[PDB]
């Protein structure tokens, strides 16, 4: 003969007063089971007493932590006050339905007049609670804000990550996708380079005929204006662009003097320098990401950054998918990711495998084991030079 | 569903009072015909599975205006026998099924509470407030209305029960904390009007716990100062004003709200020769707050709002008003 029951939920927690509660003899029966199943026969069973939502994600999260321990927070206790009639059981007591044995015992400790009943014992309140979680969305819709799917979703993510310390040592997604970006933008830099190269050489081909380093080509076209307004060392530009006094600027001037190409329209030159400025900005962003990946690779996998170098080590980890994947890979798998060269290849595969498992399984990584193994590969290079 | 038979029950409930109204000359055959037809259509759409508390309120106001019109026609017809009790009870049944159906419409909750508070169902209103407050533990509006009608009736202990439970539950917004300090000091003013309570340490204590409350904001403490500054005609009002000022001066030293309360502090019970002297003292405080190193735009917005309020207070000197205009324009 039960009166109330609590219920724990990802959106909150509630209590319900059962009116015309369930048979205790009649529990294996088909008809009682189908009556439990159908909502249309269960709302007459259970009435809502009261409901309590979470305030914040950390609040419900700590609630999960507490209830997994078995201990409770004072605000659920406040709900117990807020819905329980005050007494001790000197003449009368009150029956509460609780799932977990620790939880029920602690509530009975906290309140003398309550017999809490853990479902682990009680098939009765277990069956009640299973009807609860059966219709747990359709006894709430009028008062439930939003939904429960996304709630369970985010809450479980956070609980998993709290118990496992997830974000404090997962970074390889940023690592490998930064690598993917750098390769993509680098090839795009190459395409922009060749395109604006031939594209300006239509107006002036001596710039190709003398000038390599297409980023410097882009700098000198954004600084060049047109073919006629040239001087060597005008203001703050060619001195740090290149050699300025005696080597390059005079040759550029005499190339523009011997120049032969088509004179360009002004809005076309504006287009040209828009393109070149784009090229320079993305090359600058490449160097920013290069420094950034060196820093992040130093932060997350120092041993690999010293044994291979950051670009190639990051190539390998991106082709792997994750540092955990790299650790999972065996040695010949690392080969897949004369005879002396293949022998060295196997050897370095072994060593980077070990450095990988080290970096994947240190909490805050170090550098020194990568350093000593770098010395091992250095003396192995010496050993194979001795031949 | 089973709406035909459930509505059969409810219309059979509605029958005998209408029989009384037909043996009376108060309503004729066609009128009562129209009435029963309307009530049937109403109760049907009420007990429809797909349902909404707006249409619930529609039926609510419909039966309420029925009781009203029948009372008016009865008074015009000088009849005394017929009462309103069955109409009240069927209105209550409409509400009861409404609240069992939707546990989620706070507006309909307040509608039920207003109807009860108007028709004098005292203990019933208390118990319904109890239920709905258990149902929605996250509306300071509900908590404040509970404790406020309790403070209005005079059960200050039950007012303290409702308000203290609300403070125990709601902890994200300081609004019910504001209103609780409001009703506590209002009860203290009621004591001083009927003239521990001589100390009046309860707003001090609720500020002490508010100091470590989760919503602990400097602007929240400023609003605490504002509600304390309301009704400054008391005994320990200077005491609590000094206490909150020294508390926020100890905690938020360079806050523009701390400078605003340092400006508007000695105007507790002002409205008379004591007005312009304290005005000049607070103006010296205001000039000091202006020259001090704080967020000058924030402090100036605070002071221009409070000075627009001051301009809304009439009965002042034109020189004072114009120098407020100048000090307002110079921000």
């Amino acid at each position: 003969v039960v009166n109330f029951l609590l219920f724990e939920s990802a959106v909150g927690f509630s209590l319900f007063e059962v009116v015309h509660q369930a048979d205790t003899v009649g529990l294996e029966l088909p008809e009682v089971k189908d009556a439990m199943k159908t909502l249309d026969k269960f709302g007459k069973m259970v009435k809502l007493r009261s409901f309590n939502p979470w305030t914040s994600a950390a609040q419900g999260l700590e609630a999960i932590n507490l209830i997994s321990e078995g201990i409770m927070p004072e605000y659920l206790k406040s709900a117990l006050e807020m819905n329980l009639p005050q007494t001790s059981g000197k003449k009368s007591k009150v029956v509460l339905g609780v799932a977990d044995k620790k939880l029920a015992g602690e509530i009975t400790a906290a309140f003398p007049g309550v017999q809490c009943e853990a479902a682990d014992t009680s098939e009765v309140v277990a069956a009640l609670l299973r009807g609860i979680r059966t219709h747990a969305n359709k006894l709430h819709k009028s008062l439930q804000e939003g939904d429960i799917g996304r709630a369970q979703l985010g809450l479980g993510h956070a609980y998993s990550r709290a118990k496992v310390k997830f974000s404090v040592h997962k970074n390889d997604n940023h690592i490998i996708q930064g690598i993917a970006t750098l390769d993509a933008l680098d090839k795009s830099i190459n395409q922009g380079a060749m395109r604006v190269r031939e594209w300006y050489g239509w107006h002036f081909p001596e710039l190709i005929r003398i000038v390599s380093d297409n980023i410097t080509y882009a700098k000198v076209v954004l600084a060049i204006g047109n073919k006629s307004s040239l001087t060597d060392e005008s203001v703050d530009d060619l001195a740090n662009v290149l050699n300025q006094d005696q080597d390059k600027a005079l040759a550029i001037i005499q190339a523009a003097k011997v120049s032969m190409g088509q004179d360009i329209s002004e809005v076309d030159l504006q287009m040209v320098r828009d393109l070149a400025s784009n090229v320079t900005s993305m090359a600058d962003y490449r160097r920013i990401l290069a420094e950034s990946l060196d820093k992040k690779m130093s932060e997350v996998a120092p041993n690999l950054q010293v044994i291979l170098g950051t670009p190639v080590a990051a190539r390998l980890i991106a082709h792997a998918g994750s540092l955990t994947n790299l650790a999972k890979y065996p040695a010949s798998t690392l080969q897949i990711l004369p005879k002396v060269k293949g022998r060295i290849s196997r050897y370095l595969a072994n060593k980077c495998s070990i450095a990988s498992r080290i970096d994947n399984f240190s909490e805050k990584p170090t550098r020194h084991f990568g350093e000593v193994l770098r010395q091992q590969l250095e003396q192995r290079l010496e050993w194979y030079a001795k031949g | 569903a089973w709406v035909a038979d459930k509505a059969r029950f409810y219309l059979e409930r509605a029958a005998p009072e209408l029989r009384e109204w037909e043996e009376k000359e108060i309503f004729t055959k066609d009128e009562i015909r129209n009435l029963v037809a309307k009530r049937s259509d109403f109760e049907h759409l009420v007990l429809a599975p797909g349902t909404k508390p707006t249409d619930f309120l529609n039926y609510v106001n419909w039966e309420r205006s029925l009781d009203r019109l029948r009372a008016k026609r009865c008074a015009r017809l000088n009849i005394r026998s017929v009462t309103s009790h069955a109409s009240q009870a069927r209105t209550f049944g409409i509400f009861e099924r409404a609240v069992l159906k939707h546990p989620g419409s706070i507006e309909l909750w307040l509608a039920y509470l207003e109807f009860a508070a108007q028709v004098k169902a005292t203990k019933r209103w208390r118990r319904i407030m109890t239920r709905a407050l258990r149902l929605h533990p996250m509306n300071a509006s509900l908590w404040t209305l509970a404790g406020r009608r309790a403070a209005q009736n005079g059960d200050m202990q039950r007012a303290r029960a409702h308000f203290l439970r609300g403070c125990r539950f709601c902890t994200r917004e300081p609004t019910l904390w504001l209103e609780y300090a409001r009703c506590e000091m209002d009860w203290l003013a009621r004591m001083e009007a009927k003239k521990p309570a001589l100390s009046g340490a309860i707003p001090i204590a609720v500020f002490d716990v508010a100091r470590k409350q989760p919503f602990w904001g400097p602007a929240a403490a400023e609003k605490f100062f504002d509600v304390f500054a309301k009704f400054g005609h008391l005994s320990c009002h200077e005491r609590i004003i000094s206490h909150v000022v020294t508390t926020m001066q100890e905690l938020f030293p360079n806050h523009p709200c701390t400078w605003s309360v340092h400006i508007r502090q000695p105007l507790v019970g002002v409205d008379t020769p004591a007005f312009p002297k304290a005005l000049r003292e607070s103006l010296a405080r205001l000039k000091a707050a202006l020259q001090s190193t704080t967020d000058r735009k924030a402090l100036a917005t605070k002071m221009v709002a409070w000075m627009d309020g001051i301009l809304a207070i009439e009965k002042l000197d034109a020189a004072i008003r114009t120098v407020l205009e100048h000090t307002k324009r110079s921000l």
């Binding site: 004072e74 329980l84 009639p85 | 118990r127 303290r160 029960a161 203290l164 439970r165 309570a197 204590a205």
Partner: peptide
């Protein structure tokens, strides 16, 4: 009776705030 809210006492004292106000009212 779970139909109403009977007023609070040190048995159903919840927090430090309730403890302080109940101390004040017991002093009263």
């Amino acid at each position: 009776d779970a139909s109403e809210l009977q007023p609070i006492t040190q048995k159903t004292s919840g927090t430090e705030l309730e403890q302080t106000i109940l101390a004040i009212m017991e002093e009263s």
